[PDB]
């Protein structure tokens, strides 16, 4: 009772971007007034939280392209 698993994927893929000038970008958030009170917090096992947070972000990548790839082989005799 033989088993023969040939896992041979081929990826010749391309994620490409072309762009002229990138610019003249203005991000002017108005100021914040923030009051947080937190009494009894209990986080466990891959929690990702924000409370009363203020985040101003300007993100301007020339490319910003992304390729994600997961291969997975699971064998159980």
The experimental method is cryo-EM
The answer to whether 5 and 73 are in contact (CB under 8 A) is yes
The closest of 54, 51, 52 to 31, measured between CA atoms, is: 54
Residue with tokens 């997975």: 72
Rounded CA-CA distance 6/8 in Å is 6
- SS percent in the chain: helix, strand, coil, step 5: 0, 0, 100
58 Cβ contact partners less than 8 Å away, ≥ 6 residues apart: 25, 27
Rounded CA-CA distance 40/47 in Å is 15
From residue 34, how far is each of 38, 54, 69 by CA, in Å?
13, 8, 40
Å resolution of this model?
2.3
């Amino acid at each position: 009772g033989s088993v023969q698993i040939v896992y041979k994927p081929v990826d010749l893929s391309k994620v490409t971007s072309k762009c002229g000038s990138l610019g003249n970008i203005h991000h002017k958030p108005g100021g914040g007034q923030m009051e947080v009170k937190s009494e009894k917090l209990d986080f466990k096992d891959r929690v990702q939280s924000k409370i009363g947070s203020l985040d101003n972000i300007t993100h301007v990548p020339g490319g910003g392209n992304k390729k994600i790839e997961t291969h997975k082989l699971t064998f159980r005799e």
